Design a protein around this ligand. Structure first.
Ligand SMILES: *[C@](O)(C(=O)N1CCC1)[C@H](C[C@@H]1CCNC1=O)NC(=O)[C@@H]1[C@@H]2[C@H](CN1C(=O)[C@@H](NC(=O)C(F)(F)F)C(C)(C)C)C2(C)C
Ligand SMILES: *[C@](O)(C(=O)N1CCC1)[C@H](C[C@@H]1CCNC1=O)NC(=O)[C@@H]1[C@@H]2[C@H](CN1C(=O)[C@@H](NC(=O)C(F)(F)F)C(C)(C)C)C2(C)C
Ligand SMILES: [Cl-]
Lengths: 306, 306
């Protein structure tokens, strides 16, 4: 028992982190096979970042202008190209620590682990959600750019995020590993704000199932509801619409606990309408929405990685 | 910016995890040099665990009765001994992945990362505190015994916890790596309860400093207090006494923010007396006490490990 915000083991990703320097700008890169991936703003000065023309900045650079360090070893760069907002440096050495891996673009509401890094070295690991407004609520300082987000399935690392920037409110924005931003953000130091965020309804229901599995059952009421009536009520409280796909994904938790998804929806509606009355659920005074149905199953059933 | 419950990178510890089986009991072991450390209740049947005589159970076992697997490799056991509540299996192979390491016994209030494991394989990583009542608020299922807790300093893994059991309330108990329990618990399946827990005052102050560093400053009041008057007020709310050593440890955060420790104590007293008035601090509606002063500095200054 117990329920914690749990990150993936970070070992497979720690073996891929390198330091990349161009001129006086240093940040982190991801070394997979003979390619180093990093944010393209490694090629900017501070000056440049106010309004950079990356194509112009990159034509002026050659392979030898990129310094890549893996511990006390420099990797010779033998090719470079820009894909959207990420730079790919071909190096003369394949990373022997390369795990089985994929690049995925995740959907809003999905979670991942971040390995926060500085100068190519890990600081820490924590779990994040891709927010409905395409920000993440991270912990990132200057030097953290090129830190990545990932999921592990058995032996396979799915890389889904590379860190590029911090927005007002101290929330974070970045790209998939093809260098496409999540959300409408651009890699320029200019006024940008996140849209107003929403609560990820399906994740709140997943966490209420986790509460039941752990014996925290006070909020269960004797009612059911329709998906329709649940969504009209939830909309007022800035909750995502719950779709039939969401109901289907909650199936395994519903079956394990014997609580129909629409009965849990009736319990959540009452919590939204009445509040928690000074009570906690799994130690929290607020409803949590950064656990997916899969996160609850992996933690409560003890899924491991090889 | 941002402030997350951050775990240590787990790679150095993932390389030490093995599966240990004795008869039909399987749990996790920690392989360092040519020694595998695991909980001594690997030698029990279910029956035995109600009231085990471990010395008696162990005289009946020989080296070959212990099956140690590291992936698809069996490690030949060539010696065994019991130290307090941990079994040490000498094996014929030194773990080539052995990091620089130490065994430490931590103090109540100190934090560490747990690498939750099943059948010798990692499930996830999360941060815990040794509670004043010598429990941890973990996430552990059957099969998790032998999972360890650790801190990293630069390149050195300080192992401080090995998991043995779950108490009422779904809190957890275990040993240091010399097999001495934290708290008054014993490795027997019998009625045991944790003492009433306390709030780790120095950690609550550390987290209020983290809030200030992140720009969440509403709770700062215009008053100071004496250590004496602060401790008389805090005692009522089941907060630890704050000692002069605690004040001295908060020095670096105090100096960085320009807020004297006793001024922050005055702000905390007002929060304890008046509550948070429907407000949050760093996203939380409750005061957090599982960040140490060192945890705040490592996260807010970007300390890395090699
Ligand atoms: C990243 O560049 C980095 O770590 N570097 C080490 C050499 C460069 C850095 C990470 C940031 C810094 C603070 N916390 C983080 O997450 N990213 C940037 O500095 C980013 C680069 C410039 C401007 N960046 C910003 O994040 C800025 N934000 C914005 O302008 C905006 F979000 F509001 F739009 C600042 C610095 C104001 C937070 C570019 C976008 C190219
Ligand atoms: C641990 O043995 C394990 O993981 N094993 C795989 C083979 C054995 C296990 C971890 C527990 C199980 C549930 N969550 C956990 O953290 N520990 C035990 O089963 C532990 C073994 C017996 C009884 N143990 C208990 O944890 C029990 N608790 C208590 O009796 C007490 F805490 F109340 F005292 C139970 C199983 C009731 C939770 C011994 C202490 C030797
Ligand atoms: Cl909370």
């Amino acid at each position: 028992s117990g329920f914690r915000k749990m990150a993936f083991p970070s070992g497979k990703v720690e073996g891929c982190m390198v330091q990349v320097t161009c001129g006086t700008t240093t940040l982190n890169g991801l070394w997979l096979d003979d390619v180093v991936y990093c944010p393209r703003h490694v090629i900017c000065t501070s000056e440049d970042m106010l309004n950079p023309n990356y194509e112009d900045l990159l034509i002026r650079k050659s392979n030898h202008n990129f310094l890549v360090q893996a511990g006390n070893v420099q990797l010779r760069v033998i090719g470079h190209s820009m894909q959207n907002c990420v730079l790919k440096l071909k190096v003369d050495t394949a990373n022997p620590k390369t795990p089985k891996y994929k690049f995925v673009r995740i959907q809003p509401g999905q979670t991942f682990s971040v390995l926060a890094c500085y100068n190519g070295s890990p600081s820490g690991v924590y779990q994040c959600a891709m927010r409905p407004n395409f920000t993440i609520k991270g912990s990132f300082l200057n030097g953290s750019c090129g830190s990545v987000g990932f999921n592990i399935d058995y032996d396979c690392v799915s890389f889904c995020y590379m860190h590029h920037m911090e927005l007002p409110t101290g929330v974070h924005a970045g790209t998939d590993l093809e260098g496409n931003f999540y959300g409408p953000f651009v890699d320029r130091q200019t006024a940008q704000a996140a849209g107003t965020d929403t609560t990820i309804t399906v994740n709140v229901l997943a966490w209420l199932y986790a509460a039941v599995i752990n014996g925290d059952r006070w909020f269960l009421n004797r009612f059911t509801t329709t998906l329709n009536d649940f969504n009209l009520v939830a909309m007022k409280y800035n909750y995502e619409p719950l779709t039939q796909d969401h109901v289907d994904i909650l199936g395994p938790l519903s079956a394990q606990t014997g609580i129909a998804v629409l009965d849990m929806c009736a319990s959540l509606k009452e919590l939204l309408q009445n509040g928690m009355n000074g009570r906690t659920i799994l130690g929290s005074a607020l409803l949590e929405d950064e656990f997916t149905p899969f996160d609850v199953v992996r933690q409560c059933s003890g899924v491991t990685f090889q």
